[PDB]
Amino acid sequence: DQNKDIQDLLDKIVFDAQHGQIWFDENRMLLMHTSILGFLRKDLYQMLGLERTKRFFIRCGYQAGMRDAEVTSKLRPNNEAEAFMAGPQMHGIRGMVQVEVNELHLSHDLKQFYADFNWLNSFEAEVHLSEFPASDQPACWMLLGYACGYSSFVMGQTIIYQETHCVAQGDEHCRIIGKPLSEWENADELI
Template sequence: MSLREVSRRAPRILQRGDSLLLDEGAPPTLNDLADALQFALGDGRIWFNDNRMVLMQADVLGALMAQMIQDKGTQHTRIQSMRIGWQEGVKLAHIVMNRFPQQDLTAALAAGPRLHTIEGYAKVTTRRFEFDAKRKTYHGEFHWTDSVAGTEHIRRFGVCDCAACWMQVGVPSGYTKTLLGFPVIFREIECVAQGAPRCLVVGKDVGG
């Protein structure tokens, strides 16, 4: 069932949501999402639902980002990384909608941080998110502990004066926008690459 159809049948459910009111057992739970990840060991394939995945060492990803910075500069690397993250977020949102069709949009949004954790980007702790679909408003705050991008950046370049988890920030932007149907931009307010103990990420609707 599409989100449009869900909205038509149960508009009150989709109008507003608050992570503080979420039933922790509402699907997709962390276990539900983990069950969707399958290893076809004899075939050389990893699947998340019907989407093929790959494993990559964090050190290799860090080396790739460092090479991009050296070749094209920080600004170019930041923009391209966020675009890649955005596309991943969009695809993850479609996977959740297809595998876990439901009327609880709050639970679908809560799956985003869980997926971020499963993929190994960071341990994500949701401080709170809330939205009003009718008014097209969203606000969310999240902690990322042991972020791959931030850790790799500081290992290669030392403490810097800017946040460095560019691709990771793009993921929730694409994911949340796809589910809600209006733009939501995530920004990294604090980053381990700046010397912070963990990353603080805040998402807001464009009007906010």
């Protein structure tokens, strides 16, 4: 009853437990424990360092955002904010993070984009904290890649995000800012 805003997205998720399959449109899905994703973050950090582990998780999220954007861009093809929010809503549906809008300005025709989102109940921040104490830098790398991947697909241009605040840093919740690559001064992203 409460899912009026995401009913089009929920209808494309098919659970087939008797045959061991979960489908999101043409994509096959898994239901995995968040605690298991700490192990990957764990071993990768000890083996690769920080920036190499972060670059990996960002690339993973970036591909998932494109995957989701390929499906959601059919359900809502229209320069509309309510159409763009399919991504933030998919993030919530898949149990990864709750997006809360502070400000969203966008337009596909003008190639403009400004996003100021809060991230509540971040799975990645909890996963990061269960393996490491509070960090010096924000930790929601997979979520940030998904924001960049999904936004860049539906906007038709490179959209880069930065996590200004993070639970894993000691802040109360996470927060991100999204802008096109040209509007960032440090627009040399190695990922």
